[PDB]
Design a protein around this ligand. Structure first.
Ligand code: NI
Length: 341
């Protein structure tokens, strides 16, 4: 049954709660971004209103086949009314089309639901700078001080230069990048750009990317693998066996693969900088793990909450155990006590 932390009080509104049948007294379902843990349950057979960004609208329509009439796309940074409740959607700096939701309750309460976010100082000068926020429903995925990782711009640097060097030392090397959802497109689009290639991919992944309103995208991607020297493969397939497998299929056009697995945090973040990374090498194939995150580090989350100064925080991630919950509460208390709200 839908959990308390997916329900917005004083509304008929729910957030990312698509896998509990009909929710008793839900007039409208918000969807923060197109990722499976958040959309789980959607199909062509939904007949309640969905509110989402334009881009998430495209994904619903074309990949899940939801009927146009139940998708209500909203523009960002725009005061909108939804069943007589003022809302606003803001970029979540997560994957394409991912939003935070501001709710202005009739009773005068103001709630922010972050969806999945990577906090950034650019948020401190959005529509949020204007007014007080009583309740924060928070993406707590990395709410613990061990969780440090580099800036996205540092990681894209590393990737750009690794690939470009290798390709210039051996122009019959192929670059592969792993994937399984939307998000992290900059990894492959940055490498492709430095190498002067479109990115080659399957038909299903080409369709996904064609929904995303990326500018100039027809110039940046293709379904023709032969013509392209940056390939996208299923992340499951990014391993020696599956790379070899694939290295056979190109038909003697490349002698070497350099691959990238963009990862979430991995324990080796604790002991090694970005500038000092190494790959796993079994012959002519080489695989880099690179910690490109689309969630807030501990310190990024901390800055954001301390600026916001919310009266109450409700966690949406890592709520499943009491140890996680208890650890998280302690961080909230410290932060508040440090910042004097
Ligand atoms: Ni997500």
């Amino acid at each position: 049954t839908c959990p308390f932390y997916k329900k917005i009080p004083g509304t008929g509104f729910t957030v990312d709660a698509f896998q509990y049948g009909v929710v008793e007294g839900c007039t409208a379902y918000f969807l923060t971004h197109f990722h499976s843990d958040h959309y789980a349950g959607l199909s062509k057979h939904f007949t309640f209103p969905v509110y989402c960004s334009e881009i998430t609208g495209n994904l619903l329509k074309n990949k899940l086949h939801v009927q146009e009439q139940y998708i209500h796309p909203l523009p960002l940074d725009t005061e909108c009314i939804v069943n007589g409740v003022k809302v606003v959607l803001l970029d979540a700096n997560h994957c394409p089309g991912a939003v935070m939701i501001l709710f202005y309750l009739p009773n005068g309460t103001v709630i922010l639901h972050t969806g999945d976010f990577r906090a950034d100082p650019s948020m401190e000068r959005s529509l949020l700078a204007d007014q007080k926020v009583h309740m924060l429903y928070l993406d707590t995925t990395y709410c613990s001080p061990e969780y440090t990782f580099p800036s996205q711009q540092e990681v894209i640097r590393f990737a750009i230069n690794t690939a470009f060097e290798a390709v210039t030392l051996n122009p019959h090397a192929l670059v592969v990048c792993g994937t399984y959802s939307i998000g992290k497109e900059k990894v492959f689009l940055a490498i492709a750009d430095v190498l002067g290639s479109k990115v080659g991919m399957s038909q299903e992944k080409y369709k996904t990317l064609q929904c995303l309103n990326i500018p100039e995208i027809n110039s940046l991607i293709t379904t023709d693998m032969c013509s392209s020297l940056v390939h996208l493969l299923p992340m499951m397939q990014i391993n020696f066996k599956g790379l070899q497998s694939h290295l056979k299929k190109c038909g003697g056009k490349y002698n070497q693969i350099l691959a990238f697995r963009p990862t979430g945090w991995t324990h080796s973040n604790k002991f090694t900088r970005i500038a000092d990374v190494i790959p796993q090498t079994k012959g002519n194939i080489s695989i880099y793990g690179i910690p490109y995150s689309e969630h807030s580090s501990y310190l990024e989350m901390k800055r954001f909450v301390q600026w916001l100064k919310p009266q109450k925080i409700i966690p949406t991630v890592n709520v499943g155990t009491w140890k996680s919950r208890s650890t998280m509460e302690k961080y909230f208390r410290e932060w508040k006590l440090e910042a004097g709200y």
